[PDB]
Each structure stands twice: as structure tokens, then as C-alpha cells.
Amino acid sequence: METIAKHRHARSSAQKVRLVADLIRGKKVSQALDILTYTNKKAAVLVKKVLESAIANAEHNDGADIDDLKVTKIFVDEGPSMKRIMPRAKGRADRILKRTSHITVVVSD
Template sequence: MAKTAEKSAVREFRAEARFQRVSPQKAKLVLDTIKGLSVESALNTLMFTKKRIAPVVEKALRSAVQNANYLSQEQGFDLDIDRLVVKQAVANEGPRMKRIRPAPMGRAFRYQRRMAHIIVTVTERKTVETGSAAAPAETKAAGKPKKAATKAPAKKAAAKKTAKATA
């Protein structure tokens, strides 16, 4: 029962876009730009991103927000959609399609078309008191003195060997 109490305190809402015809590596480039942003700024960022997967990620993000809105109305808890933040944005690898490309002299080269499962998770931003959060950061910075920059000692020049001197 303790796990359900913790889970109800911090609600997460997710949406998946599965079997997308893009490599996970390319999708992660777009997903890394929206991690940690508020939903509104993440949508603005995706609107002006020129990658082909950006509209798919935007659709998944909008779906996660709608899931949050629906569940808050269905279960009757208070949720402020303006305070939603992208907590997690992941591109997992999906199945690969094996293909064959014709090669010279009757040979064939194999290659793989990759797919990605895109998962976007949003959560509500917690309220932070300004007085208690700013004070510990200042004390940590003041407690550690900065070290002076020191120059590394120069290396000794290597002795030159000549073939004529030994002969």
C-alpha cells in the first residue's frame, strides 16, 4: 500500500508512438531537445525543429497531455496542465526489417531498416519555495574555495640521436 500512496503523490502520464520508421539514434536527437522543458516550450521547440520525426514526437507529447487531462477528470484529482513538464522522452529500438541491395557481379548486400518506439512521459512540476531553495545553493558555493590555475611543467626535450655519430 505504501507504493500506491507514493505513486498518487507524483503522477506521471505517458504516451507511446510505436513502430516509427526512423532509427532510434535520429529520434533521440529530437527527444533530447525537449527533456526537462515545460510542455508549452517543448511544443514550441518541436514546431520549429526541421527533423522528419518532430511531428511524430509532437503528436506523442500532445497525446500525453490529453491523457493527463482525461485521467484528472476521470479520477477527480486536481491537475494544472500549464505546470506539466516533460519528465522523460525515450526512443527505444523496435524490430528491424532486413533488406537486400543488389551488388556488383551478381552479389547481394544485406542492410537493416531500423524502427523506434518513442515514449514521452509528462509530470506536474512541484512548487518550490524561493527562500529555502536559494540558500543551500549559496552556502555550497561559498564553502568551497576555488583553486588557482597552475601551469603544467614543461617536458624535457628529447636527446637527438644521429646515425653518423655512432658510426
């Protein structure tokens, strides 16, 4: 089994969330859950909630067992960006992009 879980339209850019997701890759679920408790970032809480989903997701539906489970394929994709007007000096306007991410996690064994 693989047993996916994913946050779609997660309010943070890829680049930032992808920085956390590089910590957890091919690591044991119990070790991976710990790191994000003591990774001083927002995207840690955002990525953890998907993993902690993926484990229950895996254990209830399909695979069972928490000991032998590794984060095989974690990846963050850039989602739809919301355009907003930011007015600048001298009359001109800039179109800022409130970015979103699609965070996927795969918890196999």
C-alpha cells in the first residue's frame, strides 16, 4: 500500500512549504512527526497536519501498523495564485499574488 493524503489550496507558497518537506523524505513516520513539532515554521504545522492525516488515513482504511511506515513521496506543487491590487506611490498599482500550494504526502512501507 501507499495511502495518500493531501492539502489542496494550502495558504502558503510552494517555495516555503517545500523547504519543510525536504526535512521529511524517506524518514520513519514516528521520527517525521517529531521534527515538525520542533521545526520553527508555519509550514511545519501545515505539512504535519497532512502527514498525521496520512497515517490515520493509512491505518484505518488500508495498511495498519504505525512502526513500519515511511514518508516515501512528499511533494509540494504550486497551486492557483489569487491576484490582489497593492497601490504604490505616484499613482501606480502592483498586482500582488497570494500564492497557494498543493501539499501531498505518501506513507508507504
